[PDB]
Design a protein around this ligand. Structure first.
Ligand SMILES: Nc1nc2c(ncn2[C@@H]2O[C@H](COP(=O)(O)OP(=O)(O)OP(=O)(O)O)[C@@H](O)[C@H]2O)c(=O)[nH]1
Ligand SMILES: Nc1ccn([C@@H]2O[C@H](COP(=O)(O)CP(=O)(O)OP(=O)(O)O)[C@@H](O)[C@H]2O)c(=O)n1
Ligand SMILES: [Mg+2]
Ligand SMILES: [Mg+2]
Ligand SMILES: [Mg+2]
Ligand SMILES: [Mg+2]
Ligand SMILES: [Zn+2]
Ligand SMILES: [Zn+2]
Lengths: 259, 96, 146, 1371
DNA sequence: ATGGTTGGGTATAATGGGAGTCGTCTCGGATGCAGG
DNA sequence: CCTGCATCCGAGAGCTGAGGAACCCAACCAT
């Protein structure tokens, strides 16, 4: 078992990149995107559809839009006289380069994500969201600026991880902005406690937050931030009493009321 | 519990004692009209305060909970009659 | 191990403060505990009461500290003994662990005395928990009290 | 509404799962954090599961009824009952298929057995660690072609699917030794420190420098990593063309004139294994295209491929390269497993396995049989194997996983909501990654996580670490944990419940009550009978309506005094049920008529305390109210305490005098003995009277007058009738204990007035003087056993009503006489005999001698220890004898002696500990201290002796604590194995029977000895005679129920040598299906009459066996100077003993051959001879030149039941099991009939194994019920086919219970996952035959008043029947 | 028409984890390895 | 080729009562 070591092994089974290979792959991806848009202009079809069919042909039969239409469009692309099959070639090469770049940079995602444990998401969920951010960064990277890929990719990986944490960490979903409000309130209260030598009051937290903040608003914000408890929480030393055994039902009418 | 105005537990061994006595109707009353036959317990209370005798019991709610939870494990549990045709215990409230 | 204090009367709280538990975080499991952990070991003499324990499924897993016993800095229970020198009982009191106690012959606290001298030919004693009969010359320590 | 007759369980197809659901759950949102309302398409959506409010949509456009079946257009919520939120399911559509863990992790795996894959291989494929091959497409691995169902590692699949290539770095300042595009053979060095490993072409990767001539002289250009080289190696360039392209135009390299291009100092070299094809114009195939040999690549077909591979087109070198790789289709995970399962043809596999069954090897035969079991289950049920893989996951209705708001404004929720949220999150992320064309590693990881999420939802913690909520260690409760266990749905909510109309309170003794009465507190009864009370107050004028009466009763100070009289009116004639936990047997619940009392305690009759096992140091009881007329009738006729006077386990009285009642009756019926006279001789009675007047002779001294024994009291006081004697007692003339002469029933009895008073008490209680005179034993003191015999005889001769009246009279008079008798306990009552001192001094001498014999060498350590132990044991026995002799001779009326002799309280061991000495004590290891405790409890122990006894006290306490759980577990197993056995008919018509033996072989193997009276009574009383018997000039006909007098007659005839065994009907030979018949069961032991048809005898048997074990079988153990419960458990589970004896396999004669190194026993018969080699230290029960039958033991120890079944037969093993189980209960003084053990054993011997299928569709080695194989054989014989050959089996109670046909009972018993998986695979149907299934469904059990034999009875009066008859005659 | 909520982007470079568990006793089957 | 025998894994272990860790900007649907 232990899927973390399994994934780490699969990750380390791919060699890292040097500057030459990384810049070569990024350039190949950029030229592939340019070739894709040129091909779309030549054939008159949508860039998205042509990108999808080219990616399907690159990934092959292993990855399961249907074979009929993709084969039709792939043959229509083979109908180009010359100087356009070249664009098709650069498109395919750029897609292969995109795949290779993502695979090679998968380790930075793990290195970043190992610092966000213990915040309501498991390690592998954090890794997968970081992978999504990495794919975004590969999509948006620009090698002309002579910047190392990790420099640009770290921002997108962090954005993906934080958005995932704010979106999927609570049983009751809270909007992103108000999650940031809760986190800011917690940080403010913690620093106030550190300075005061005791737990602050709602008035002091309101004053420290700034304008537009009073004790009632702080109370409401702390009220909504409560997480639900488990109906299966054990009660007592023995494993025979749970929490939900003490909670009556108020919806269904009682026999007295029905009579 | 007394703090929750609760009832006493009629556990497995009490059911065994009732079975050993051959008290079939008493045991069925404990299982349905007094625990979780909702329609049954409502009708029993109404009949007792009206002066009549308690009516016949129905399926306990706990069996319906069991059926629904077995369905959640992707198991098809069906109640059939003497001709192996399905009988609906949910009163048509769970069929599209 | 942090328990709602029992305070029905003063003795209830005093009893609660002297409780010793084999259970808890990092301890034995009641359903898994066998017979060896619940026994009255011979080294419990003077350190853990052989009588006071729960009657149900916790019998032997919760016990009480004996009246004269003291827990040291290393966490081992010690009990006191009077030093007997040449058949004469002194007032020097030594607190021993079970390991040190296993080394000596210890006489009973009801041994007859004339002044502070063992006035009996035959003395009931313990040697590594074994009841033995010895002469007063072989006695090295003596119980303080029942 | 049709009635439910069967329950079927089966597998659910994805179509079935999707037809169940009311919509797809697509979002992990539960409720809106602000409005607390369900979110759209989440786990609580009203559009899927139903409205929160009754007949009201979410938005509120519709808020009334008769909108049923109307879905609001604005909100999409159907207008109907809100209760549908606990019935309607949802579903989740998985992006990729996932496997149901129940069919993977349930050993042996169903999927693995169907596909012939091991557990390890299934784990590797399912969790994405290995590929499995489907359509190999002619690929080659290590020179061997790949085949279907082959497992490939990552490297193996990578080389087969993409090719081979290695890139080698080149250090700066070191140049390669080969050109670009040149082939390399393994070992060809490309650098002074670099040697290639794989054959194929070598290509440059980022050459650092470029050399270009100029038409010639050379020149160099350094190339930095941020720029690329466009020109290929070894090609001409023109003036104005760019060579090394760069980001910046001013950094580009453009040759000034013509020249060639060469590349030097490569950054790395990439060696591949591929084919090379140069071209000059447009190509056909692009990069990423896989081709076969002889395909068109470029030049309009001029170049063609020679190998399979993947195409890469290099435009710099204008060449197409075919990397050698294949198009093998190997998959991972549940998609691959489902693909394999969909292709499986079950009939061809069945034929192949049927052919495999004929292999000579038995291991291969077992493997084929196990596979055919699953294959045939799938073929018969109609399920498809691919349905074991989940495509749509069902979602439980929200009201069964509630999100409730606690009274404090917080929320509480189930773990299923978190599990569903994790599953939905991972599914959505997988869909997003798939639509985004992610690499294969990320998709593999996400699919693995999805499989784990489904596993956690279905069965958490079964594989890997269980899922826990963040910040907490507690595992989440999954659906499996909900279903199974002691806290699961089955055992906690279906087989037992909490009930209405119940209460509980402390119990108090009720000496003034009758046997059918209990004292019930007034407040308890007001709450318990509240609706009846409301109706009664309505009938009167206390309240105008029911609501007013309820409001009145709500407030304590608002209650009037007429409501109490109304309450007395309400409960008139009704009964309540009293129950004390634990309910070990059925007499733990009893029906009593309530008497309303002031106070808060329930008053309990003294005579039911033994049936309840209740005393009065804080015990509590529960009160239940049966509601309907049927329930009240059942409680009053079947459960009333005054109707249950005999024990169902043994047939002995269970309501009987005890404690103070016994004490008082014994005190008044014991006569005085005096020694002042002491056997003097007198000639005439006047002289005896004169000597008594002088004071020389006491009144009760045994003197001799005129040559005959008598006393002064017998001559002095002659009374004309009992009234005169009791008048003399009331005047102080004589005591109740003085022996006088009374004329009674026309006979001059020499007896005491107390015995005459006791006779009058009985005669007046039963209202018949002659029968009462016949019942009692006049000339003995009344103690426990004589009083029990009196109660049993009164029952037999008069009935339960008169027996209950007699019981109440005996209770009253016993209490009255023990109050005034003067019984008390002082310290001087523990009399110390003088002999004890002597016995100690003698011991002190003998001990010395032992030490001497040890000092001089004649004794070793072990022998000296044994001698000391034996000496102290004998001294303890002597002191016990001396104590009891001293009591008998000197103090016949002593309180301890009276208590122990009458049976009221105590046994000799405790009295010895009080008076004589405590004795030897055992160390915690189980060995005995050398020095005993020589003091008693009266003298007082010393500190050391007390500490020595503490070890035994603690050991006894811990033994009780363990034995309780073990015995409860045994009782539950027995109930599960016997619960369906009911008395279903009058007679099965069988002619088989069993023979109860009246003699047993001796211990020392001397000869046959008559059995104990109790054993024969337990084996014979109440049984039906199988054949006619003729003993002592009395003919007992066939079909006669054996009463206790008949049993005594049979014992008397056995003692005269006329009979050796009795043939009786038994449950072991009954042919009734699903139960027994009336004749084969015999008496209802609690009624001393034939059993009624419809009685649940299996439950009674289980309770009768289990109740004694709970405490009796090895109560407070007293630490004073293989076996027990484990032996019974071993016998019932049919386990092979550790000290298993050796039993002769066949008949023969015995020849013992012992050598200096080995010992052996030979059994030699006229046909064959066998040899048994056993360890030399073993003990033999056989002598040389002896005759031994088949199965006869040759060694001391426990006999393996399976070996006995193989050797001797099924009747032999049944007899052995019954006898060996009864031995343990007899050792503890427990009386229990053989019927119950025979019921359980008949269940244990229920199955057969097929050895030869004959002309049937059975398989060899298949285990099935004996009834089924018998019916199949009967059909085959009728139709003219070869019979099925079978052999009997023996399995334990656990395995026999788990092998039952009903899946509901087995699932509710134990091992729920296995039972449910097997039943679902087979499509099993439950016929609801036993009691557990009907209890689970809340149905009327088929026993007692629910039996088909009695439940259709009608009742009608004469006038109505006449009217109906006339109506029939008219038409 | 106003807050409430949702989506996109930030550019030096960063590239394989962490808490943990060792005081249960049995039994029955499944399974791989030793021998002939 | 057969067989038995260590080895390992999983499911059991009485009832009742009481007990509680970034921020910013810009647009878009809801009401
Ligand atoms: N069913 C059942 N009855 C019990 C149990 N323990 C005690 N009893 C009954 O309750 C009576 C009084 O119990 P005691 O041991 O005196 O006291 P308690 O009420 O259990 O409470 P404490 O000793 O204060 O812990 C006993 O004599 C038994 O009849 C138990 O675990 N189960
Ligand atoms: N865990 C438990 C503890 C107790 N019980 C039940 O309560 C009773 C208490 O006996 P007890 O211990 O009060 C008898 P004791 O005073 O020693 O007996 P004596 O006067 O006859 O000599 C037991 O017999 C069981 O029925 C239980 O079911 N589970
Ligand atoms: Mg107690
Ligand atoms: Mg008692
Ligand atoms: Mg009691
Ligand atoms: Mg006279
Ligand atoms: Zn609506
Ligand atoms: Zn029969």
């Amino acid at each position: 078992s232990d899927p973390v070591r399994q994934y780490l092994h699969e990750i380390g089974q791919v060699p890292l990149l040097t500057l030459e290979e990384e810049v070569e792959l990024a350039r190949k991806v950029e030229e592939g995107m340019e070739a894709i848009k040129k091909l779309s202009e030549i054939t008159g079809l949508d860039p998205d559809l042509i990108r999808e069919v080219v990616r399907a042909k690159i990934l092959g039969s292993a990855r399961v839009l249907d074979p009929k239409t993709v084969e039709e469009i792939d043959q229509k692309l083979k109908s180009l006289p010359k100087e356009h099959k070249r664009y098709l070639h650069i498109a395919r090469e750029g897609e292969a380069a995109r795949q290779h770049l993502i695979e090679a940079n998968l380790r930075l995602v793990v290195s970043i994500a190992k610092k966000y444990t213990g915040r309501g998401l498991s390690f592998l969920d954090l890794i997968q969201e970081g992978n999504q951010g990495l794919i975004r960064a590969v999509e948006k990277f620009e090698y002309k600026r002579r910047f190392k890929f990790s420099t640009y990719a770290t921002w997108w990986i962090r954005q993906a991880i934080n958005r995932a944490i704010a979106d999927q960490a609570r049983t009751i979903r809270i909007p992103v902005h108000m999650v940031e409000t809760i986190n800011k309130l917690s940080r403010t209260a913690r620093q106030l406690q550190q300075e005061l030598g005791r737990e602050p009051t709602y008035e002091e937290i309101a004053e420290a937050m700034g304008p537009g903040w009073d004790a009632k608003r702080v109370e409401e914000t702390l009220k909504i931030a409560q997480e639900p408890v488990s109906l299966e929480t054990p009660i007592g030393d023995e494993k025979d009493s749970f929490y939900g055994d003490f909670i009556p039902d108020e919806h269904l009418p009682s026999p007295v009321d029905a009579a | 519990g007394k703090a929750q105005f609760g009832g006493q537990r009629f556990g497995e061994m009490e059911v065994w004692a009732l079975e050993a006595y051959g008290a079939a109707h008493t045991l069925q009353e404990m299982l349905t009209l007094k625990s979780d036959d909702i329609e049954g317990r409502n009708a029993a209370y109404e009949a007792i305060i009206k002066g009549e005798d308690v009516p016949e019991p129905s399926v306990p709610e706990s069996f319906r909970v069991l059926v629904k939870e077995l369905q959640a494990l992707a198991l098809d549990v069906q109640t059939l009659d003497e001709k192996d045709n399905p009988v609906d215990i949910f009163e048509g409230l769970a069929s599209k | 191990l942090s328990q709602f204090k029992d305070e029905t009367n003063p003795l209830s709280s005093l009893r609660h403060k002297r409780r010793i538990s084999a259970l808890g975080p990092g301890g034995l499991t009641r359903e898994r505990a066998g017979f060896d952990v619940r026994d009255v070991h011979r080294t419990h003499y003077g350190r853990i009461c052989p009588v006071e324990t729960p009657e149900g499924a916790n019998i032997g897993l919760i016990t009480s500290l004996a009246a004269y016993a003291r827990v040291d800095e290393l966490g081992f229970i010690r009990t006191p003994y009077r030093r007997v020198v040449g058949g004469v009982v002194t007032d020097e009191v030594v607190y021993m662990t079970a390991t040190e106690e296993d080394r000596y012959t210890i006489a009973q606290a009801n041994t007859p005395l004339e002044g502070n001298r063992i006035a009996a030919e035959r003395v009931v004693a313990r040697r590594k928990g074994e009841p033995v009969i010895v002469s007063p010359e072989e006695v090295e320590f003596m119980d303080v009290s029942p | 509404k049709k009635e439910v007759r069967k329950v079927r369980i089966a597998l659910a197809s994805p179509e079935k799962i999707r037809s169940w659901s009311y919509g797809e759950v697509e979002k992990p949102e539960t409720i809106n954090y602000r409005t607390l309302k369900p979110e759209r398409d989440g786990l609580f959506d009203e559009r899927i599961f139903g409205p929160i409010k009754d007949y009201e949509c979410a938005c509120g456009k519709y808020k009334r009824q008769r909108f049923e079946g109307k879905v609001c257009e604005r909100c999409g919520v159907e207008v109907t009952k809100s209760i549908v939120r606990r019935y309607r399911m949802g579903h989740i559509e998985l992006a990729t298929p996932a496997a149901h863990i129940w069919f993977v992790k349930d050993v042996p795996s169903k999927i693995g057995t169907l596909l012939d894959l091991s557990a390890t291989e299934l784990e590797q494929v399912l969790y994405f660690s290995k590929y499995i091959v489907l359509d190999p497409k002619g690929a080659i691995l290590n020179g061997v072609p790949v085949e279907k169902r082959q497992l490939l590692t990552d490297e193996e699949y990578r080389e087969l699917r993409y090719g081979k290539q290695e890139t080698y770095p080149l250090p700066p300042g070191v140049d390669a030794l080969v050109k670009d595009g040149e082939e390399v053979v393994k070992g060809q060095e490309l650098a002074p420190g670099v040697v290639s490993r794989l054959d194929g072409v070598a290509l440059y990767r980022f050459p650092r420098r470029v050399r270009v001539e100029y038409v010639t002289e050379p020149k160099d250009y350094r190339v930095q990593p941020h720029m690329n080289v466009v020109v290929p190696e070894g090609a001409r360039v023109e003036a104005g063309d760019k060579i090394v392209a760069a980001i910046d135009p001013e950094e580009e390299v453009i040759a000034e004139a013509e020249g060639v291009v060469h590349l030097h100092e490569p950054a790395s070299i990439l060696v591949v294994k591929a084919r090379v094809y140069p071209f000059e114009d447009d190509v056909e195939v692009s990069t990423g295209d896989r081709v076969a040999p002889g395909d068109v690549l470029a030049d309009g077909g001029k170049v063609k491929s020679d190998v399979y591979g993947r195409v890469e087109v290099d435009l710099v070198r204008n060449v197409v390269r075919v990397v050698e790789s294949y198009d093998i289709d190997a998959r991972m995970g549940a998609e691959a497993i489902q693909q394999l399962l969909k292709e499986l043809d079950l009939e061809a596999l069945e034929k192949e396995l049927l052919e495999e069954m004929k292999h000579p090897s038995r291991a291969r035969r077992a493997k084929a049989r196990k596979r055919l079991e699953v294959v045939r289950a799938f073929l018969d049920s109609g399920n498809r194997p691919e349905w074991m893989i989940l495509e749509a996951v069902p979602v439980l209705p929200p009201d069964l996983r509630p999100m409730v708001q606690v009274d404090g404004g917080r929320f509480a929720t189930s773990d299923l909501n978190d599990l569903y949220r994790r599953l939905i999150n991972r599914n959505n992320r997988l869909k997003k990654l798939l639509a985004q064309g992610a690499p294969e590693i990320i998709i593999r990881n996400e699919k693995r996580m999805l499989q784990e999420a489904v596993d956690a939802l279905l069965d958490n913690g079964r594989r890997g670490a269980p899922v826990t909520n963040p910040g907490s260690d507690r595992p989440l409760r999954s659906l499996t944990d909900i279903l199974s266990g002691k806290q699961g749905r089955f055992r906690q909510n279906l087989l037992g419940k909490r009930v209405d109309y119940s209460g509980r309170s402390v119990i108090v003794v009720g000496p003034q009550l009758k046997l059918h009465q209990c004292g019930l507190p007034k407040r308890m009864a007001l709450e318990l009978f509240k609706p009846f009370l409301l109706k009664k107050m309505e009938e009167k004028g206390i309240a105008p309506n029911v609501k007013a009466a309820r409001r009145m009763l709500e407030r304590q100070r608002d209650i009037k005094d007429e409501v109490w009289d109304a309450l007395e009116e309400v409960i008139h004639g009704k009964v309540v049920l009293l129950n004390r936990a634990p309910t070990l047997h059925r007499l733990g619940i009893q029906a009593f008529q309530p008497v309303l009392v002031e106070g808060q305690s329930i008053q309990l009759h003294p005579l039911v305390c033994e049936a309840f096992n209740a005393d009065f140091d804080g015990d509590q009881m529960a009160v239940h109210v049966p509601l309907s007329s049927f329930a009240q009738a059942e409680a009053r006729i079947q459960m009333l305490s005054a109707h249950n006077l005999l024990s169902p386990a043994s047939g002995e009285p269970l309501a009987k005098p005890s404690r103070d009642i016994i004490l008082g009756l014994y005190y008044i019926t014991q006569v005085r003995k005096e020694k002042k006279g002491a056997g003097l001789e007198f000639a005439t009675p006047e002289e005896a009277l004169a000597a008594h007047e002088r004071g020389e002779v006491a009144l009760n001294a045994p003197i001799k007058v005129a040559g005959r024994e008598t006393s002064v009291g017998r001559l002095k006081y002659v009374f004309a009738n009992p009234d005169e004697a009791l008048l003399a007692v009331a005047h102080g003339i004589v005591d109740l204990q003085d022996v006088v002469t009374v004329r009674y029933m026309g006979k001059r009895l020499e007896t005491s007035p107390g015995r005459i008073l006791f006779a009058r008490i009985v005669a007046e209680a039963v209202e018949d003087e002659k029968v009462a005179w016949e019942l009692i034993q006049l000339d003995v003191p009344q103690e426990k056993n004589s009083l029990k015999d009196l109660v049993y005889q009164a029952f037999l001769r008069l009935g339960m009503e008169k027996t209950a009246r007699l019981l109440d009279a005996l209770k009253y008079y016993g209490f009255t006489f023990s109050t005034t008798s003067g019984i008390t306990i002082g310290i001087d009552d523990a009399v110390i005999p003088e002999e004890k001192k002597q016995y100690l001094e003698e011991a002190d001498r003998k001990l010395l001698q032992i030490e001497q014999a040890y000092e001089m060498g004649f004794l070793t350590d072990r022998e000296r220890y044994d001698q000391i132990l034996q000496l102290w044991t004998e001294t303890t026995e002597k002191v016990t004898q001396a104590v009891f002799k001293n009591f008998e001779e000197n103090y016949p009326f002593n309180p301890l002696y009276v208590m122990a002799q009458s049976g009221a309280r105590g046994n000799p061991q405790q009295i010895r500990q009080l008076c004589g000495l405590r004795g030897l004590m055992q160390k915690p290891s189980g060995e005995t201290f050398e020095v005993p405790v020589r003091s008693s409890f009266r003298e007082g122990l010393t500190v050391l002796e007390y500490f020595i006894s503490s070890h035994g006290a603690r050991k006894g306490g811990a033994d009780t604590a363990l034995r309780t759980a073990d015995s409860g577990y045994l009782t539950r197993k027995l109930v599960d194995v016997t619960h369906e056995i009911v008395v279903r008919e009058a007679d099965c018509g069988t002619t088989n029977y069993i023979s109860v033996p009246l003699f047993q072989p001796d211990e020392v193997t001397r000869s046959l000895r008559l059995r104990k009276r109790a054993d024969i009574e337990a084996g014979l009383y109440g049984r039906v005679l199988a054949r006619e018997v003729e003993v002592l000039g009395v003919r007992l006909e066939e079909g006669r129920y054996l009463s206790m007098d008949d049993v005594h007659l049979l014992i008397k005839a056995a003692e005269a040598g006329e009979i050796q065994e009795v043939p009786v009907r038994s449950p072991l030979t009954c042919q009734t299906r699903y139960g027994v018949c009336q004749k084969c069961y015999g008496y209802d032991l609690s009624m001393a009459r034939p059993v009624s048809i419809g009685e649940a005898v299996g439950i009674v048997a289980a309770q009768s066996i289990g109740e004694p074990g709970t405490q009796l079988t090895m109560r407070t153990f007293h630490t004073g100077g293989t076996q027990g419960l484990p032996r019974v458990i071993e016998l019932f589970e049919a386990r092979r003993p550790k000290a298993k004896a050796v039993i002769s396999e066949i008949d023969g004669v015995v020849r013992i051959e012992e050598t200096e190194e080995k010992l052996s026993v030979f059994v030699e018969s006229e046909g064959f001879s066998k040899e048994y080699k056993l360890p030399k230290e073993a003990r033999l029960l056989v002598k040389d030149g002896d005759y031994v039958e088949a199965g006869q033991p040759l060694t001391r120890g426990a006999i393996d039941p399976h070996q006995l079944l193989e050797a001797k037969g099924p009747e032999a093993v049944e007899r052995y099991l019954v006898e060996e189980i009864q031995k343990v209960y007899r050792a503890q003084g427990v009386k229990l009939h053989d019927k119950h053990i025979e019921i359980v054993v008949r269940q244990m011997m229920k199955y057969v194994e097929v050895t030869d299928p004959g002309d049937s569709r059975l398989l060899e080695g298949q285990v099935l019920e004996k009834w089924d194989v018998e019916a199949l054989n009967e059909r085959l014989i009728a139709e003219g086919k070869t019979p099925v050959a079978w052999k009997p089996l023996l399995m334990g109670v656990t395995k026999s219970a788990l092998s039952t046909k009903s899946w509901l009972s087995a699932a509710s018993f134990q091992n729920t996952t296995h039972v449910l998986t097997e039943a679902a695979i087979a499509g099993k149907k439950d016929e609801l035959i036993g009691l557990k299934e009907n209890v689970i469904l809340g149905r009327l059990i088929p026993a007692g008043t629910g039996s088909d034999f009695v439940r259709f009875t009608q009742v009608v009066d004469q006038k109505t029947l006449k009217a109906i008859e006339e109506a029939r005659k008219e038409a």
